[PDB]
Design a protein around this ligand. Structure first.
Ligand SMILES: [Ca+2]
Ligand SMILES: [Ca+2]
Ligand SMILES: [Ca+2]
Ligand SMILES: [Ca+2]
Lengths: 26, 148
């Protein structure tokens, strides 16, 4: 079972929406 | 080119703006709630407040631009390092079949704001398909975040 996406999470998918690459440096 | 001192900040400023729908410099429970309700889920009034209360280090109940630059640095410790990737994945694999498709990514795109075109979205997944399966899997989504 899960419990909604945490904070840094929503930031993980949005950060992925950068340009045309994949993976986050963070 | 190379992550500099401005390229990084600009990235966070974008995320801090995505939540601040109005752009007043303070994320409320409704704002973030709208984002959690657009991705395709349903945040709980109680959990939501408890969620925006985690980053809220001031104790006011609202997130701020500075709180952002300071929130992504408090989760990269141990209680949220490898579990945050599995979550970002779920967003892409809404169906939870064990793979991602340019379609699932196109959905998340408009759910956050920008909606990459098609060729780009197609190439974005082709560059990650280290195996060339027409879609991205879990190993890739991770092998790309584990190898620095
Ligand atoms: Ca606001
Ligand atoms: Ca605050
Ligand atoms: Ca899928
Ligand atoms: Ca692949």
């Amino acid at each position: 079972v899960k419990l909604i996406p945490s904070w840094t999470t929503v930031i993980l998918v949005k950060s992925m929406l950068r340009k045309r690459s994949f993976g986050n440096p963070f | 080119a190379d992550q500099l001192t401005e390229e990084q900040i600009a990235e966070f400023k974008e995320a801090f703006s995505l939540f601040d729908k109005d752009g007043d410099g303070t994320i409320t429970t409704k704002e973030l709630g709208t984002v959690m309700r657009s991705l395709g889920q349903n945040p709980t009034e109680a959990e939501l407040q408890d969620m925006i209360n985690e980053v809220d280090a001031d104790g006011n109940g609202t997130i701020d631009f500075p709180e952002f630059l300071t929130m992504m640095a408090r989760k990269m410790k141990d209680t949220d390092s490898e579990e945050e990737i599995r979550e970002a994945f779920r967003v892409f694999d809404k169906d939870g079949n064990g793979y991602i498709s340019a379609a699932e990514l196109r959905h998340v795109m408009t759910n956050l704001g920008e909606k990459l075109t098609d060729e780009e979205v197609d190439e974005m997944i082709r560059e990650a398909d280290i195996d060339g399966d027409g879609q991205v899997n879990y190993e890739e989504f991770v092998q790309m975040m584990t190898a620095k």
